[PDB]
Every structure is written in C-alpha cells, then in structure tokens.
C-alpha cells in the first residue's frame, strides 16, 4: 500500500505468534521490539538514540509479517518507548519513500 | 525522488543559510537538528526517544528546503546524534511510504 504521512505509519505486525502494532521507521538502521520472550539464542547489545542508549537482546533470523509481507531478520528486543520496523526489514517488504 | 532503503535516507537540506545533511524519518513526529544559531524567540521543549530524552530549543515556522522542497513548520535543535527530518515536515514536500 502507499501510506501518507499525516499521522505516525503504524502497522499489525505478528511475530513470535503475537499480534502487534509497530511504526515503519525510515530513520532507524535496526528494528526494536517492546519486551517479549521470542524463542532461542540471542546476544546483549547496546543501541543509541534520542536519549541515550539501551540494552537489547539481539534475535536473528526472526520471521514477522509486517502489513502481510512476510520477512525474516535481525530482531532487537528491549526496553524501547515503541515497536520500531527499522530498514533491514523496510528492504525486504520493498519499502520505499517517494515525494 | 523515489528512495530505497538499503542505504540511510539522507538529503542536502538548507536551513538558516546553513547546508545540512538530514535524515527522512517516518518514525519521528517532529524535526530535530543539532544545535545551530536560529534567529529568533523559543521556547525550551523535552523531548523522548530511544534512551531517554533531551532538552531542546523549539523554533516555528522555519523555513527549510528539504531536497529543493521548501517547507515551514517548527524545527526543534538541541543535542542530537543525527539531524532529523520527521513528519511534521515530511507531509509538507508530499511524502509518502510505499510498498
Ligand atoms: C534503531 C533505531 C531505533 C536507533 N537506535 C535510533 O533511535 N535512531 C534515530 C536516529 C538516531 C540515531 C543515533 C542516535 C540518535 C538518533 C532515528 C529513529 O528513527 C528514531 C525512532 C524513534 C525511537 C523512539 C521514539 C521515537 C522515534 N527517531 C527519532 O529519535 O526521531 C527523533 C525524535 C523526534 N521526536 C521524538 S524522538
């Protein structure tokens, strides 16, 4: 779909079996994640942005169906303000911004 | 343009005399800038991201050319790691998400 921008580009996302909401984030390198107990191995990572930083759990090769696209990447999960889909995911569901 | 999204979305940006590099970020309600000498009257603003947050100086009605675009709204500076181009300036230059 082509999304305008008039409000915050929120879309349903499952992932891990869970529904959720998530905002596409063109500004964000990597996608983060509110807490939750995706499954498996994963590694501590440090992110920086307004603000600071936090610490995440860095999850790879994640499947989410962002809109109906489906994906699999790296997933950053830890105590952010909001569900960010960052670009490495944008990519693969061919997201693109046009003005 | 139309942007893809394997690289960061960076634009030129003209703002106060001044060239700029500045991110396109559908994640970000308003638009922040590293600190520069706006004329002007403000008004000191918080704001939150990833991290916490950060105090800032909030300008309106600031012109900004954004790709050759020319936009007005409020420009909010202050300490920054990257300098942000959010939705209250993307709708003016007609962008749009697509996918
Ligand atoms: C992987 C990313 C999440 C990453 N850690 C990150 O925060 N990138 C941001 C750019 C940046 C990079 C490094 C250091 C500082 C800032 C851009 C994201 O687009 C972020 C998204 C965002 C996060 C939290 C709350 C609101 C937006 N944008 C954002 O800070 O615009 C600024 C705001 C405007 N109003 C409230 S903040």
Redesign the pocket.
Known sequence: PQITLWKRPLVTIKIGGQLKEA?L????????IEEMSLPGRWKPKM????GGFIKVRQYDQIIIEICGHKAIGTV?VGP???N?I?RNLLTQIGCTLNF
């Open positions: 905002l984030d063109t500004g964000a390198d990597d996608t983060v992110i920086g942005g307004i950053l952010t303000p909001v960010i960052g």
